[PDB]
Every structure is written in structure tokens, then in C-alpha cells.
Design a protein around this ligand. Structure first.
Ligand SMILES: Cc1cc(CCCCCOc2c(Cl)cc(C3=NCCO3)cc2Cl)on1
Ligand SMILES: Cc1cc(CCCCCOc2c(Cl)cc(C3=NCCO3)cc2Cl)on1
Ligand SMILES: Cc1cc(CCCCCOc2c(Cl)cc(C3=NCCO3)cc2Cl)on1
Lengths: 19, 283, 253, 238, 238, 283, 238, 283, 19, 19, 19, 19
């Protein structure tokens, strides 16, 4: 389960990723 | 479908075309209403109309948006007692299954002879605190079809519901709701009837010989509390997946009693909504 | 045709008149399968020498008779071989054939209801939580009731018929595998019955799986000399008997 | 599990919502639905059937039937007037009508409307009335000429018997309110004598005309609301 | 997360709902299910097996067995009547019957029904009864002629012994109520002598007939409800 | 499947064909019920039937809709004490695993000899306020199979459930529910039994030698409170995924005690549902 | 959002449920898992290893080691008996055993079992015991003949030294209860002299035999529950 | 997988084949247990077996269903004070990370030398009302690894958890739960140890030199209330995704203290579960 | 979102459709 | 909506089916 | 329903599997 | 996640889009 930005804005999202 | 259904443009009405004048024989404006039929005349016929592309849906004019709306049909009440708990016919409600026990909505159906539907059903308990603390007042609603043991009093053996339906609601947790199949031995619910129980010149006659469909025996499970209360569990009802046959003239006289038509008020002259005019000449 | 012939051991039974035969739950009795099994030893299966036609003690059919029962795993606790193998082994499993004979003449009138019953937990005659005693639900060839008298000190069952001895209106009893013996058409009654029990092989001593009941419904009525006695004789045949869990030997009681 | 957020509206109850509910009575197979002649599917249908109009909306008449007939009289004068009513379909005499009774279940109405009149006169009898629709804008006309100036229909009583007058839809707002409103004023309709009521010998000289109103395919309603025309100053007993 | 709205019914409890629940005892592999002769899958099955009828539903008889037999007698008169019971399958004597006992678990019943009778008479004995089903509409018939007029079956006692009488389904409402109801009145069934009971010499002159009732493939029930026929005016101890 | 399952038309009953008259030899109406079998006669056989296409399902007549319904089988009660907390055999309940301890539903099964199922299970705690404020009364239910340390009293060491099941419910949060595998060493649950403990003329005999399956030792975790209470946690039970073998005649005599058949009332004559008639001649 | 209904069980807590939980310490990469000789994956394994049996379950002996040895004696008489224990694997002397200790963690047990005996005698010494498994049904046998009648194994003491006796699974119920239960009684096992214990000159005349019990691939348990064999009538300090 | 995993038939046991007699040389029943190995003899070997197709899974006999069960391992307690709020070492709990502080479950592991796992973790706060109203009592649990500022008292600066974990639970909202990675510098958790701190004849020796993994400093955030309380927040623990190495003999002597083996009771003779027999001859 | 008769029975479902 | 045995064990599931 | 590790970390997940 | 008009009517929906 993931990438389901339930919210529109980007500022709202999980902790980013890593690379 | 979507768009048409989301945009609510399912049942659209025709538009008003353009007309020209008519110095012609056939007179559409003339028909003989005695045929019992209804005229078919339109704007375009009578006048020199223009051209209006319409955009009004007759969606909300469907027996489902006309009927499919929740309505108070009963207000179960329990003025608890702690003095005598249990006792016969106490602290538990029971009420005969029906609609005619309360107007506005009774009105509404009665607009048709026969009706059929799955019913929604919702319970809105409201706990009035007559004490300094209401505690935790659990509740048990259930349904007693015919012929079934209807609780004589509060803790019968019938509140075990080993094979009956009992919905439970505890203060906080939301309104209990549920739904129901169309319950009738008949293909449709009889809103009316011109039948009787029998030849007994003392038999019953009405909507009713055909609707003994239940009753509801109630219960506030929690046991004895300290600080009193009074519970008022409101019963709303919605018609989902409805059909209707043979429309009738609406009601204009405030009824009295259910499963009957009777209007004849207690003394007061029979009153109706019609207003009086001084003269027909001026409106 | 009504005539019937049955051969089970070294024994055969005939009947020049009958009301079909009945197979309990429409299943024919047979031997246990390595699927439903559980035990681990090789069962001894006496064939013929065991599952043969044993006939019990006979009884009188009275105008005062009330009814009599026999409990199967138990009725043959003495019937040679089968009834030894019973006592020598822990696990026992077997199905039966019940031949109920009761003749009189075409000038007689009577009706017997015969029925077998899986787990026939009888009720005590006395109010309470005291269950019927061992020694009294373990009568033997002889069976129980008749319309008899006995100590009420004994944790004694219900001699009560109409309630089914279990307290179920007899008459719904027709749900159990059955048939009647209407002396005007019938002569016998033949029940055949497989092994019914939540376990692959039970204790032939502690547990009686099948219970058989015979109940006079319409009272015997002749116009003859009461010198004319019309017995009722029961014959039984373990079928597909299988035993296991060999050892010393229990004891008679 | 699913990280969820419970939204504002959650747990509420609306007498107007489409949601599912566990059905008590699982496994129930309802009585089949036999065939029954005449089933509705839209209020509209009922709205297109002409129901009779109380118009003789006058005093003692009112609790009786007469309250439905309009007798066409003598008239010593000429070019005299018969009656009038206003179009605002929720206004006694209109209201009570199968239509009115209804419309009063919705907040807004629209389209054309149909008024039909019938001569319960005689056969040998004759007449010619002028009916008119005076759109919203001014006052119900005091005189015929003034009213004839707008929308109307001359009606020749004859072997036919029923003249149907259409009420076009004239309005600013695609839609009108069902509730009394000075703005959404639909106007007036009135009837007058064109000629007279002539009857040859030994025929009565007054006779009646029944009047009705059914909808037009124009027609349509919206915003359901609870009715006007019925106060249950009860309760209802048992 | 998922913007969700909690619906009205939420958190409730229904003694009649299909929902899953965390199973305590995870990883448990239940005892295998061995094979067992005779397993049911439908009440119906039980309903199709004829159970005996208490009919001699009379006084002292009742707590005994006799309460099941019906002796066919003398009858000095002729064309006389035997018994009657009413069809409403939840009505002592019926009720208690495997069927009745059941039906009383549901609110509604339907279809045909089967009544079977058996002669516990003699062999050399003879008789001929007339059984009849008097549909709902009137009163249980006082006389045979009156009853013979409707549904019936003449029964010739002979080498056979069992006559089975069917009770067609006659009703207005596809369905009938299991609970006593004047409306859903199923009717009456009665039995009378066609001829007599003749017995040659030295044979008893009274004899019995047992009666039973099993269902028809017609049959079907619905709307489960808790029974009638059993009040636990206990409790139950330990 | 859906439609058939949603429309509930899985098990449908045949229709009644049309008949004509029969002046023929073979008489289907004549059979000899002594064979113990059941007649096979139908409408079409006996009368001159018509033609009715049926539409009744025997769905609700399935051992799963007959059995699969929640029923009170126990009412755990705790009249708390604050005076002595803990102490031996207090403020914590324990109860022997079974059904026969309470009718209506006991009745229902008993209709069959053997039975098998996964059981639903639900707890309906109801907190009666005997004080001026109930606080936060947490709860611990759990299950004590054989042979296991059953709490001697309230805080044993057994309430650690290091390897047992304990469900926790705190006032507000909804009814605890859960389910369970079919627990028996046997392939099916013995509703009855004609066995004993042993040859001991004092051995046990019944449904019961075969059902020592538990018990439930209870607990109100929260510690000592000020204002008293009494808790009544109702135990409902539902049978899901059920099977049944060898039907039996229903019960007509009010029982007494469980794991036994015994009816013999205390003095009162044995009473049954059968009613008395004046005469067979009139019904 | 998603019209949802919160089900009964919701919000509870079960010491026996499989559900996920936000992991505090996000982004943590645990110490690698090096290789380690001997890792278990199933209790079973432990259950198949024979652990020693306390059998000399007698008085003063008990708190010591001896509590493990069984000295094979003189025996003036012949055909005399050695010992007995009962099979119900949760019954001292059994219980405490790696198996027993365990089984007492589950409610039900099943399958065959293995008893092994070893001669801590001498080399020049000789004997022959008869061991027997007396299935459930009767009383632990008073005499050898009576016991020899069921399941047994004659054991010839010799260059080998260990005789292993199997305990077949005999039961009605596929499964047995771990808890003391008259029903689920597994039976008894006993040991007797077949011949004697003969020893040539100047060798002791009593010697010991150790006994053990490991499982069979038959074996299996279920319904986990908290143990019997350990009451923490503590607490535990710091 | 599903079926096998849903039906729980993953680890199935072999069946018992059929045998015949053997009047042959090789005697499988004879082995020398001194080899330290275990015999391999079976039913089929010793007797004349039959044929039983089995159907018992060793699923529930897996280190994960043996271990994977929640167990009380600690009962944090806070007898609040309103008199002195804050003060040193008050109204806030702290407790050393471990298991051996409480039996039944301690027992259970100890069955193995080494162990490894991700731990579930659940908190069951229970608020006992010692007042006439408990208000809104918020709570803060958190975790203090080594070496970290452990709150001296109630509001340190450490309750800011700028980089620590603090779970918050407010009366009503459900039980806090969460999980955790396997925390050890080592490849596995040492249930035991035969090591010391050092050569110091006063060094530490046990499970413990290797497990200073934390502690938990607690806090009831809400501030000063009027009516008192006492909070008891129970700490349950579950082992998910477990592995185990080198099994050990279970414990039979009631311990005392943790991180030690010590049994030697205070005076009382060392007691064990073994029962005494009169005679070996009769069981 | 639709046609997800979360419940088995048909009696339980949204307001029907239109056609 | 269906066959979503949200729980592992089989004992936990809806009322069975019919056939 | 399964394998929906609603949470990122692995330490958070159901009871493992069996093999 | 989007375009899941959980509700029937259009009047009920998120803030429109942009174009
Ligand atoms: C006229 C007319 C209209 C109707 C419709 C009848 C619909 C039945 C009422 O439905 C309910 C049922 Cl069956 C049970 C309950 C109930 N509430 C708590 C327990 O049972 C509530 C309602 Cl609205 O009947 N006659
Ligand atoms: C006859 C007959 C019928 C049954 C069925 C027995 C089913 C077991 C009861 O199931 C429960 C269990 Cl195992 C535990 C709990 C429980 N509640 C709180 C803790 O444990 C409740 C129930 Cl209904 O047994 N004999
Ligand atoms: C022996 C032995 C066994 C273990 C296992 C140790 C597992 C660590 C305990 O896990 C917890 C942690 Cl790290 C924090 C919290 C916590 N609760 C509130 C704040 O932190 C609770 C637990 Cl059970 O250690 N020695």
C-alpha cells in the first residue's frame, strides 16, 4: 500500500523517499 | 448514464418548438372532456410560440424521490421506573406496526391505492437526564412478528431473540439503521381495502384486516440505575425501491385514527383547505 | 411382492408377508475407511461367526402392554462371539438388522410402532439432575419396561412412553427410522441400520449408539380365548462388525 | 490498517440520504410481484390529468359541490364579465386541485398549463365566451377590451363542448416559486361574454360550465418540500 | 488517509447479521469431519416426513397416547360424521406435529399439504369413509352432503390400508400467516362414513385409524421468528 | 449466483402442473405407511390442478438461516464490591461452557442429534450506575480451556494470558465480537449422548461426559473505584458454517437443568402445549 | 468519503490477533542475522527427543535423582511385577517430562507415543522383562497374564540394552484432552519379569533401568492454553 | 497456499500405514540410547497397524503460535498526587526494559537459549476514579533508550521528544499499539548468558550485562486536576516474526528476581511440580 | 464509486435507479 | 463486494453459501 | 485480503507465514 | 486517489478543477 496521496496538495504526503 | 444520472438529466421534458399562424379547419383546441380522456393541446397549438430548448428533468418527480425520504412514524417513549422494575407491561414498549398512526407521510402514500417497497429504518434514541448522571443506558429494539411471544414485561424469555431480530445501541455509538425486505403475503402493500374480516356484522373493514405485521416490544437492558431518565426513541422510515399503482385524489380533511378513512370531527364542522372568496369576479 | 428372505450368518430368516424394509438414513452398513479412521491397530473383523442372526428373549403383547425397549450395543452383551469381542476390546463398531416378528390371525386387530433412535438419552422419572443409572439402561436381551414395577431409589428412567422417555411427543418419533406392524397387513418389521456417531469407533460398553423402541399404538383386540398369547420376538444381526484395542477383558455386570 | 481520516458529516443522519443498511431478515425471498394494471412512475403523469376546479369559491357554496360549477347567466348588459382566478397554481381556488395539491410538495414550478372548460348547458342552447390569460405585469383587468389585448381564446359553444385554453409560460426566471411571492406572480385568467347565451323557447336561461386544469408537456417541478394544504392539528388516535 | 464517512447503523449489533470477526485461536486445525449417515440441509426435508396427529384432542385422553388414535365405531345412524380439525397448521391438534412445531418458527407458510390415514382395524374388517377439505369461506360443515360439495376423497378400506388426502392450496394471498388470523384462515377437513364398518363374526366392532400429516413439494415457509409452542417459564438449573 | 443469491432464489420449489381426470387403475392415493416410508402424492395427483409457476425459495429453510442467528446463552453478572477487592471467588466471574443453561435456542438445536459449527460470539456489557459516576470501567474476558489455571480470585497470575485469549472492552468502544473454530476432539458436537463416564454405578451419563469445554473467568481490570456498579455482560452466540445430522422430534416439555433430558417438574403435573377439545366433531 | 459501517468487535483488543501497527523507530535496519547452529521451527522437534522419566515417584526419593532410576531386583517369587504409570501424558510422573511440560501448553493431544528403557545393569548380567500397554477400558492390571493379553513387548536384555515400546493410539475421539478427564483416559503401561535377573558370581544382584519417552510422527497437539505445571506464587523481585 | 493456510494444513503429519507380522532378524525395537540419539521406531514397527490417513497439522506447534501471543509483562502504576505536582521522581513512571520481571511468559521463552523477534506492543491504560469526576486525563508514554535523559521528574525537557518516541492516549480513543524492530547489537536476543561485566570479582553475570535496553519514563500530561485518580497502564507484548535456537528444559522451580536463575526460596524447601506416589506398583 | 452492495440481501441497497 | 476474508482463519468468515 | 503492508517498515506486519 | 465521487449528486464533490 502506497502512493495514494489521499490529499491534493503535495505538502501533504508522507516522509519523502530516499535515493 | 453517469452524467445523465449525476447531472440528473435522466427524464427530460421536450422543448417548445416554433409556430406560425393557422387559419385552418381542424381545431385542436376543441375536444369533449366527457370522453373522460385528457386533452392533448400545447403551447405550440394555441399560440405563435418561439423555440425554447428545455433542460428540466422530471427526475425529482419520480415515485422514488417523492417517496424515498425518511419520516417520523412513531415516537417510542419510556418514562423509566426504578421503584418497580419489570412488573407487568413496564419499562418496555411494544406498538403496532403501521404508518397511519401519524399524518404528513401517511398523507403522501395514500396518494396511491397500492404500493410496494423495501423500507429503510432508522432509530433516533434521545436520552433525557432527569437525574444528576445518566450512566450507560444500553438499549434493545426488536421486532415481533405475529404470532410471537411479545414480552409480558421487561425480562421475558423473548429478549433472548434466539431467532428474532434485536438491534442494540449504547450511548455514544451512532444511530441504529437497517433495512428490510418487503414483508407482505400479497404482491403489494394495501394502502387501502374494501374488504372485511368476514360476514359477521361485527367484522373489521379496512387497511388492516390486512396489516398485522408486528409490533415492537422494546427494552433498556442496563438494569436498575440510580438517577432516573426518560427515553424517547424516534422511528423514521424511508421507502427505497418503490412502486406504485392507481393514483388517488390527495386527502384534504385532517384524519383521526388509523386504518380508517373517517373524518367526521368531534363536533367541529368538517374543515378543508379551501378558502372563501367574496366574488368570483376578482381574484 | 411382500415375501422376504434374509441371510446373515449360518442363519437365515423368512417372512411370507412384510412391509418393505428400511435402511436407516438410506445408508447401508459397512466397514470403516482409512480416511475417517483414527485408531492405529488392525481391527479384528469376525465375519459370519459374529455378524449373524441372534434372536433375543420373547415378549407378550397385552391389552395392558405399554411398550418395551432394548438398547443394541447392549442387547447382545451375551450373544456368543460378538458379545465377547465386545468385552475384550475397547473400540467396537458395528451396524445391525432388526427383524421384528409378531403374528396372530386375520381376526386380530393391533398396531405396533417400531423405531430405532440415534443417541436416546432417556430422562429420569424423578425431578432433578440425577441421570438414569448405568445398570438400568443396560438391561440385555431381556429389554426394559413391559409395564413394570421397580425401586424408586434407583436413578431410574422414565417408564413414560408418550413423551418418548426423552420428552418429545411420541408421534414425532416418526422422524427416527421406523415402521409399524399393523396385524391386518404386516407380520414383521425390518430395520437395517449403519453406524452413526461423531467417532469412528466408540466404546461398546459405555456407549449404546442405537436404541430400539416398539410401542403398541392401537391395542391388541381379539375375541378369542386369552389362552391365545401373541408374543413379539426380536432378532438381531451385527453387520460389518469391527473391533480393536485388544487386551485383558472387562467384566460382566 | 488503512490509515483513514473520518470526515466532518460522519455519524450524522439525514432524512435525505442514499446509503445501504444491513438487512435484518437475511435470506428472505419476498412474495413475487404479480402484474397489476396501472402503475405510476412519475408524479408528472398525475399532473397531466385534468382534475376539476373549485371556482365558485363563494361563501355557502364552498362546502357543497356547486363550488365547482359556474353558471353562465342572463346578462342584460353586454360584453360583461364572468369570472377570474389567478394562475399562481398554489392559490385557492387552484391549490386543492390534483396539481395544486401536489405542487405544494415542491418549492419550484415551471412550464405551460392548460385550462379546459365544458358546457353543461343544453343542446339547442348557444353561446360564445372569451377567455384570457393576462400575464404578470399589471392588475387583473376590470374590462374585456383591456384583457383581450393579451393572450386569449374566443370559445364557440357548439357541437363540441370543450374549449381548452393554454397558459404559455411567460416569466423572467426560468423558474417560479410555488410559494406566494410577489415576484414569481404568474398572472390572471378571466372569462367574458363574446356574444350571449341564446336559447330558443322553453329552455332554461342559466346553465353551467365546469372548468379544469391539467399540465402541459412543458411542465416540471423541483425542490421537494412538505405541503401547505394540510395541517395535522391532531393527533391521530387508535 | 481515506476520507471516510461513518454511516448510521455503525457500531450497532444485530442478532441477524453477516459479518466476519477476528478468530481467537489462530492456527487451529479442527478435527477432521468424518462421514456420518444422515445429515440435513433443509428444514423442508423434516417437513416432508409424516409425523402423527393428536386428534383425539379430548379431555383425559390428551395426556396419554390414545390422544393419537380415532376409533371408528358402530354408528346406528348412517351417513354420520367422524371428526374434524382445522387446517391452520399452528392449531392444536396440528401445532405439536413435526410440521406445526416448526412452522411456529416462521411467520408465513404456503403450499399444499398432505393428510394420510391408516386403518389399524382388522383384516376381515371393512369400511368406507369420506374425507373432505372445506376451503376457507364458510363454516365447518354440520352435514356430509354439505361438505362433499367441495374437495374430498372417498376412501375404500381394503388390502391397502392407507389413503392420503391432499389439501390443495386455495388462498387469495400467495401467502398465509402462521399466526392465528381470521383472514389467512385455511379452512377445515372432516371425515364421515360413506358406508359402514362391517365385520364378520367374532371380530371387534370398533377399531382405530391413525392419522398423519407430511408436506407437499408445494410447501415453503419464511420470515423466521421465535416459537409459540414453548414457554420456558423456568429458568433452567444446574 | 449473485442474482440467485441476492435475489435469494437458490433453492426453488417446483410448480404445480395441470391435470386432467383419471378413471384409471393405479391409485397413487393408496400407499401403506407401515413401510415406514413417506407418501409421495401431490396436488396434481388428487385433483384437477391448473398451472402455477412457483417462486418461493427454501433459502430461509436452511440449517444456516434456521441456526445462524445470535442468542442469549448466558448473562454474566458482577455485583462489584470495593470493601474487599480480590478475596476468594470475587468480582470475577467464571461459568461453564454450554448452551443447555438457557432454552429458546437450546430448543432449536436439540432438533438434531449431531451438529457442527464455527461459532460467532459476541459480548454485550451493560454498566449499571449505582453510584453518582461510573468512571472508566475497563474489562477482561477470557477463556479457560481445560485444564488451565482458573482464577481463584480477581488478580491471579492467569490474567496475564501469556498464552490464552483475553478480549478487552472499555466503556464507549463497541461491543466485543470474535469468532471461533469448531472446538471438539470429535468430528461433531454431541447435542446428545447415551454414554457414561464409566461402569461406576455412580458415573455420569449425558451430553456432558462430552463437553467440558471451558469455562470463562471474568475480570473488571480498572482497580478500586469510588461509586459502585454492577456489570451485566450478556453472551450471545451464532452458528456460522453449520451442518446437522439425524433430526429429532422437538421438545414439548419445559426442561430444567442442562446436559439432561429430565422433565419431571417439581410437583406440578407435566405440562405440554397440547390444548383440549370438547369434541372431535367440531374444531 | 467511503460510507463505512464499524463492526461489532471494533476497537477491542485480543491477546490473539494478527494485525499490523505503526513501527516507532522508522528507518531502522536491524543487526544482520548471522548463522547459528541449531534453530527450531516446531515444538514437535522437542517432542520427539526422549527426555528421562521420574518414575521412582516415591517419597524421599523424589527430591533427589534416584527419582529417575528403577532398580530391578531380586524377586523370590516369579512372574512378579515391576512398576506401572498411566499414559495420560499430563500425569506425574509423566507431566514434568519435556513432552508433558509442553503438552500442558495445549488443550488437546494425539497420536502414538514411545517409551524407551535402558539397562544400567552389568555386562555379565542378564534379564528379560515384559512391558505392556493396557488400553483404556479397564483397571491397571493386578497380574501379568491379565496384562499380557493386550499390547506388549517382551524385552531381552542383551548386548543391545535399549528396548523401545510403542503406545499405539487407541481412542474413540480422534483427539484426547490434555487435562485430566475420565473420558479421554489413555490407559496404563506396566512392566513385569518374564524370567529373572541372573548374574554370575560376584556381580551385584540389583541394578537399574532408566526410562524415557519421546513422541511418534503420529503425534500432534492443539488449542494452545497456559500451563498447569507452574504457579508463580510470587511475584518476582529485583 | 491459501486453502493450505486458511484451512491450516501447512505442516501435516504422516499417516499410519498398514503392517503385517514379522518373524525377522532385524529388530528395530532395539537401539542403544546411550548414543545420545533418539530412537526412530513407529507404530507400524511394533504392532500390526492398519491404515489411517491423518489430518492434523502441526501449524499451531510453530514457534510463532507458541510464541506469538500477547502477555502482561508489566503493570505501570501512578497514584497521582495534586499536593506536589512535579517534585522529584513523581507522577511519572520509568521501568527497566525486560521480561523476566513477570513469569508465565518468561517461562515460555526460556524454553530456548537464543531468540529473535520484532515485538508487538500494546498499552492498556485503566483509569480508576477515586474522585467524583475524572475529567480528561491525557497520557504520554515514551521510551528512553540508553543513554538518554530520563525524566528526573514529570516535566523535564525530555518530554519534548524532539527525537524520541512518545505515544499519546486520551480517554475514549482506543488502546495504543505499535510495533518494533528487533533491537539488539547482537544477531539475536540473549535469553541467557554465561558471561560477566569483567574480571572484577564484583562484576555482573547474567542476561543482563546484555540487556540494557531502555527504560520507560511515563507521564499524565493533563496538568493538575481536582478529583484524584490512579492510573494503571498494563503493558502486553507479542512476538511476531520470531526465530529460536537451541531448546532447553522448561523451568520447574518458581523463580524470584529477573536476569537470574536463582531459585533458592526464602526458607521454604525448593518446591517443584512433581507429585509423590505411595508405590510404583499402582498408578 | 458504486454497485458495491456491501450487503448480501437486495432489500439493502441504495435508492434504485431510474430508466 | 465479497470474498474478502479480511481475517486469516477460516472459522472467521461470513455465513456460508448455499448450493 | 492480504500483503497490504499498510506500514512502511517491516517490523510492522502480521505474524509471519509458515513454510 | 481521486474521482471517487462517493456521492451520487454532483453538487457534492470536491472543489472543482482548473483549466
Ligand atoms: C399503510 C401501511 C404502510 C405500511 C408499511 C409497514 C412497514 C413496516 C414497518 O417497519 C418497521 C419494522 Cl418491520 C420494524 C421496526 C423496528 N424498530 C425497532 C424494532 O423493529 C421498525 C419499522 Cl419502521 O404498513 N401499512
Ligand atoms: C450442547 C452444546 C452446544 C455447545 C456449543 C459450545 C460452544 C462454545 C461456547 O463458545 C464460547 C467460548 Cl469458547 C468462549 C466465550 C468467551 N467469552 C468471553 C471469554 O470467552 C464465549 C463463548 Cl459463547 O456446546 N454444547
Ligand atoms: C529476556 C528478554 C526479553 C526481552 C525483550 C525486550 C523487548 C523490549 C520491550 O519492548 C518495549 C519497548 Cl522497547 C518500549 C515500550 C514502551 N511502552 C511505552 C513506551 O515504550 C514497551 C515495550 Cl513492551 O528482553 N530481554
Amino acid at each position: 500500500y502506497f502512493n495514494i496521496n489521499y490529499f491534493k496538495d503535495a505538502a501533504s504526503s508522507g516522509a519523502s523517499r530516499l535515493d | 448514464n453517469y452524467i445523465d444520472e449525476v447531472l440528473n438529466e435522466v427524464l427530460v421534458v421536450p422543448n417548445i418548438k416554433e409556430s406560425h399562424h393557422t387559419t385552418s379547419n381542424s381545431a385542436p383546441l376543441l375536444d369533449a372532456a366527457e370522453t373522460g380522456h385528457t386533452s392533448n393541446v400545447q403551447p405550440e397549438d394555441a399560440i405563435e410560440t418561439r423555440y425554447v430548448i428545455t433542460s428540466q428533468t422530471r427526475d425529482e418527480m419520480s415515485i422514488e424521490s417523492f417517496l424515498g425520504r425518511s419520516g417520523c412514524v412513531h415516537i417510542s417513549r419510556i418514562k423509566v421506573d426504578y421503584t418497580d422494575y419489570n412488573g407487568q407491561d413496564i419499562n418496555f414498549t411494544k406498538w403496532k406496526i403501521t404508518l397511519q398512526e401519524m399524518a404528513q407521510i401517511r398523507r403522501k402514500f395514500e396518494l396511491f391505492t397500492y404500493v410496494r417497497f423495501d423500507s429503510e429504518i432508522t432509530l433516533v434514541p434521545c436520552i433525557a437526564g432527569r437525574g444528576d448522571d445518566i450512566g450507560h443506558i444500553v438499549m434493545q429494539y426488536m421486532y415481533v412478528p405475529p404470532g410471537a411471544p411479545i414480552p409480558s414485561k421487561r425480562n421475558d424469555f423473548s429478549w433472548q431473540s434466539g431467532t428474532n431480530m434485536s438491534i442494540f445501541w449504547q450511548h455514544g455509538q451512532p444511530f441504529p439503521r437497517f433495512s428490510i425486505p418487503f414483508l407482505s403475503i400479497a404482491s403489494a402493500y394495501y394502502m387501502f381495502y374494501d374488504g372485511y374480516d368476514g360476514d359477521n356484522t361485527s367484522s373489521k373493514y379496512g387497511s388492516v384486516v390486512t396489516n398485522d405485521m408486528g409490533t415492537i416490544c422494546s427494552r433498556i437492558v442496563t438494569e436498575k440505575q440510580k438517577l432516573s431518565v426518560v427515553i424517547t426513541t424516534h422511528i423514521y422510515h424511508k421507502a427505497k425501491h418503490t412502486k406504485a399503482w392507481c393514483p388517488r385524489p390527495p386527502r384534504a380533511v385532517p384524519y383521526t385514527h388509523s386504518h380508517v378513512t373517517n373524518y367526521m370531527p368531534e363536533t367541529g364542522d368538517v374543515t378543508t383547505a379551501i378558502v372563501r372568496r367574496n366574488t368570483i369576479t376578482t381574484a | 411382492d411382500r415375501i422376504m428372505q434374509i441371510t446373515r450368518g449360518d442363519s437365515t430368516i423368512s417372512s411370507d408377508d412384510v412391509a418393505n424394509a428400511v435402511v436407516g438414513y438410506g445408508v447401508w452398513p459397512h466397514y470403516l475407511t482409512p480416511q475417517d479412521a483414527t485408531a492405529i491397530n488392525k481391527p479384528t473383523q469376525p465375519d459370519t461367526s459374529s455378524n449373524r442372526f441372534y434372536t433375543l428373549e420373547s415378549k407378550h403383547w397385552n391389552g395392558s402392554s405399554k411398550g418395551w425397549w432394548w438398547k443394541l450395543p447392549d442387547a447382545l452383551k451375551d450373544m456368543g462371539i460378538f458379545g465377547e469381542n465386545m468385552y475384550y476390546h475397547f473400540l467396537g463398531r458395528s451396524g445391525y438388522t432388526v427383524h421384528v416378528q409378531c403374528n396372530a390371525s386375520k381376526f386380530h386387530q393391533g398396531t405396533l410402532l417400531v423405531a430405532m433412535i440415534p443417541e436416546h438419552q432417556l430422562a429420569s422419572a424423578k425431578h432433578g439432575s440425577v441421570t438414569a443409572g448405568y445398570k438400568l439402561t443396560h438391561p440385555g436381551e431381556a429389554g426394559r419396561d413391559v409395564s413394570q414395577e421397580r425401586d424408586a431409589s434407583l436413578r431410574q428412567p422414565s417408564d413414560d412412553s408418550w413423551l418418548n422417555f426423552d420428552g418429545t411427543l411420541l408421534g414425532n418419533l416418526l422422524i427416527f427410522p421406523h415402521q409399524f406392524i399393523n396385524l391386518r397387513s404386516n407380520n414383521s418389521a425390518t430395520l437395517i441400520v449403519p453406524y452413526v456417531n461423531a467417532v469412528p469407533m466408540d466404546s461398546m460398553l459405555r456407549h449404546n449408539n442405537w436404541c430400539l423402541v416398539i410401542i403398541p399404538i392401537s391395542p391388541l383386540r381379539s375375541e378369542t380365548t386369552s389362552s391365545n398369547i401373541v408374543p413379539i420376538t426380536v432378532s438381531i444381526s451385527p453387520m460389518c462388525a469391527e473391533f480393536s484395542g485388544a487386551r485383558a477383558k472387562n467384566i460382566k455386570q | 490498517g488503512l490509515p483513514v481520516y473520518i470526515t466532518p458529516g460522519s455519524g450524522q443522519f439525514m432524512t435525505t440520504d442514499d446509503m445501504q443498511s444491513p438487512c435484518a431478515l437475511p435470506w428472505y425471498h419476498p412474495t413475487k410481484e404479480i402484474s397489476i394494471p396501472g402503475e405510476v412512475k412519475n408524479l408528472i403523469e398525475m399532473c397531466q390529468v385534468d382534475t376539476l376546479i373549485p371556482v365558485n369559491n363563494v361563501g355557502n357554496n364552498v362546502g357543497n359541490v356547486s363550488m365547482y360549477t359556474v353558471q353562465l347567466g342572463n346578462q342584460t348588459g353586454m360584453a360583461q364579465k364572468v369570472f377570474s382566478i389567478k394562475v399562481d397554481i398554489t392559490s385557492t381556488p387552484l391549490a386543492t386541485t390534483l396539481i395544486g395539491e401536489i405542487a405544494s410538495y415542491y418549492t419550484h414550478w415551471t412550464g405551460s398549463l392548460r385550462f379546459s372548460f365544458m358546457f353543461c348547458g343544453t343542446a339547442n342552447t348557444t353561446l360564445k365566451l372569451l377567455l384570457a390569460y393576462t400575464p404578470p405585469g399589471i392588475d387583473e383587468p376590470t374590462t374585456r377590451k383591456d384583457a383581450m389585448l393579451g393572450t386569449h381564446v374566443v370559445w364557440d359553444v357548439g357541437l363540441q363542448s370543450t374549449i381548452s385554453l393554454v397558459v404559455p409560460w411567460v416569466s423572467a426566471s426560468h423558474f417560479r416559486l410555488t410559494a406566494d411571492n410577489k415576484y414569481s406572480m404568474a398572472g390572471y385568467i378571466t372569462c367574458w361574454y363574446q356574444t350571449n347565451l341564446v336559447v330558443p323557447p322553453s329552455t332554461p336561461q342559466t346553465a353551467d360550465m365546469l372548468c379544469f386544469v391539467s399540465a402541459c408537456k412543458d411542465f416540471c417541478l423541483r425542490m421537494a418540500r412538505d405541503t401547505d394544504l394540510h395541517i395535522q392539528s391532531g393527533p391521530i388516535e387508535q
